[PDB]
């Protein structure tokens, strides 16, 4: 791809999400989602192989279906309210359709079935964009419509995403599917706290984006898309194994790390609202996520897998890859828990 | 700036005419003295009913009848 065309297309992805974040009219929300999907299709077809075309076709079909359901929810809102303000919806059917549409755009279970396929089909940088930047616009729409979101629907989606994303990553050896099921479980955690305190939704979103960007940046820096190619990293770059160790222990939510910060605050907001069974079962279900994170830490940092002879050639060459913000992201994804009360800046 | 223009006029006169007509479309309404009259004629066209005002007692510029002297006039449009 032409680098100028790449810059214009990435600015258009950003512009679509920004239009979603700044607009007061529902048509401009829908336009921001259309602009974002249209611009992100070439980022997925960047390398021109049949797996990327299949991933882009599956992504197109799910996001287009969600976009039509979103427009039907907008149109039903216009029936029962005569207006277009991005605020609470004025019909429970429109609220259900918009919550379904946003759950499809997020890839929350049981609309999760595209996220491991599309994440596996595309390069690591475009899957980084898919799992971090593409969550931002539907979460902002969920933020603004929460006075009309049905509680049982959003909590069903939340627990179903956490359980399905926990069990889905246990069977995986591909790193992109591991990050995709990890994404599904973390979005379940974000929507579970949404009607109680959406500031903790924003906190979980930001910490998830930092940790996921860290893991994708490590995978890009080591050119690893499988568990077994990530297991060669100790014989090539031993600092990278320490970084994937601390970041995966943080994504499991183990204190004293920063990824313990969201779920703890989420439990802290769900028990104030007298929900005790639900954050309990959510936290116990997240042990599945920690189990396959620990599987990756065993294969990468805590043991030394056998290498190959040709690795000795790669000892003679330094990493020329721009590992953009990787030390900053690695520090923020691990050492941020003593600054947990900084979350009030999200209020 | 002069050999280039003659070169592109010899090779591609369709594109030279296209960019010339488009440039005259862009810059000439800012240079026309009659662009103001377009706005004046559009705002002088009465699509709606001129809903009258309650005479509170002190409105010297608002007429009491259409044939009164005060009020907006269209002599500029009859004359031009």
């Amino acid at each position: 791809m032409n680098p100028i065309i790449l810059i214009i297309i990435l600015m258009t992805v950003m512009l679509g999400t920004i239009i979603v974040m700044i607009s007061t009219h529902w048509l401009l929300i829908w336009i921001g989602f259309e602009m974002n999907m249209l611009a992100i299709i070439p980022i997925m077809m960047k390398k021109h192989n049949p797996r990327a075309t299949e991933a882009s076709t599956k992504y197109f079909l799910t996001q287009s279906t969600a976009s039509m359901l979103l427009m039907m929810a907008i149109i039903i809102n216009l029936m029962f309210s005569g207006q277009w303000t991005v605020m609470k919806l004025f019909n429970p059917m429109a609220s259900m359709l918009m919550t379904m549409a946003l759950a499809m755009k997020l890839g929350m279970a049981p609309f999760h079935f595209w996220v491991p396929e599309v994440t596996q089909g595309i390069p690591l940088s475009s899957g980084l964009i898919l799992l971090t930047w593409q969550k931002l616009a539907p979460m902002s729409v969920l933020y603004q419509i929460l006075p009309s979101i049905n509680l049982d629907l959003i909590l069903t989606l939340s627990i179903l995403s956490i359980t399905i994303g926990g069990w889905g990553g246990l069977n995986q050896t591909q790193l992109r599917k591991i990050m995709a099921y990890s994404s599904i479980a973390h979005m379940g955690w974000m929507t579970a706290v949404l009607l109680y305190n959406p500031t903790m939704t924003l906190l979980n979103l930001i910490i998830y984006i930092i940790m996921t960007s860290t893991m994708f940046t490590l995978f890009m820096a080591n050119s690893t898309t499988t568990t077994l190619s990530l297991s060669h990293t100790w014989n090539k770059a031993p600092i990278m194994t320490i970084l994937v160790l601390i970041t995966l222990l943080s994504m499991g939510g183990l204190p004293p790390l920063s990824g313990f910060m969201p779920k703890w605050m989420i439990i802290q907001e769900m028990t104030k609202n007298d929900s005790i069974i639900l954050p309990t079962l959510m936290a116990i279900t997240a042990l599945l996520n920690l189990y396959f994170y620990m599987r990756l830490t065993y294969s990468t940092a805590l043991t030394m897998f056998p290498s190959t002879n040709n690795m000795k050639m790669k000892w003679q060459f330094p990493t020329t890859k721009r590992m953009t913000l990787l030390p900053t992201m690695t520090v923020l994804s691990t050492m941020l828990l003593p600054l947990t009360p900084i979350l009030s800046i999200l209020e | 700036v002069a050999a280039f223009l003659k070169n592109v006029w010899a090779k591609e006169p369709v594109l030279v005419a296209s960019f010339a007509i488009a440039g005259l479309a862009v810059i000439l309404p800012t240079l026309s003295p009659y662009t103001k009259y377009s706005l004046m004629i559009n705002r002088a066209t009465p699509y709606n009913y001129p809903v009258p005002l309650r005479d509170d007692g002190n409105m010297p510029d608002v007429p009491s009848h259409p044939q009164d002297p005060q009020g907006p006039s269209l002599e500029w449009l009859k004359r031009l």
């Binding site: 509680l151 049982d152 909590l155 009607l195 109680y196 769900m270 104030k272 609202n273 007298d274 929900s275 005790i276 069974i277 639900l278 | -």
Partner: protein, 140 residues
């Protein structure tokens, strides 16, 4: 299916055994139909007859679990004269687990489902007693 749970929980324990058994059977049948729907959705059966056989098998399995659960719970509430007691639903959940083991034709699945479904039904009874909320309304 929220009204199915309401017509289950409206009747007091150990009073009307046949209608409690029928209500729990209907709850189990609805859960079996949901499982059958996603089962023939995500996994295509080889024929229409195989699909309706899987649907009838899962629906009758979950309905028999619900029937033997509600029957055993109401009979244990009658013979002990303790309606507000989670040991009744512990026995009922173990009976439903033995039913799930009998449908899968295995003893180990039966004992595991006895233990876990009995503890789950005991927790559901305790949550009905003390008012435990799973989908709690936002209050603060």
């Amino acid at each position: 299916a929220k009204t199915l749970l309401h017509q289950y929980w409206d009747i007091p324990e150990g009073t009307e055994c046949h209608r409690k058994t029928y209500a729990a059977t209907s709850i189990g049948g609805a859960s079996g139909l949901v499982v059958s729907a996603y089962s023939v959705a995500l996994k295509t059966p080889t024929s229409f007859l195989e699909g309706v056989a899987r649907t009838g098998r899962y629906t009758f399995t979950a309905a028999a679990i619900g029937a033997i659960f509600g029957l055993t719970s109401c009979i244990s509430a009658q013979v002990r004269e303790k309606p507000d007691d989670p040991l009744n639903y512990l026995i009922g959940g173990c009976a439903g687990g033995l039913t799930l083991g009998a449908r899968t034709r295995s003893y180990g699945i039966g004992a595991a489902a006895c233990a876990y479904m009995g503890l789950t039904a005991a927790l559901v009874k305790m949550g009905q007693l003390e008012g435990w909320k799973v989908f709690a309304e936002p209050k603060v």
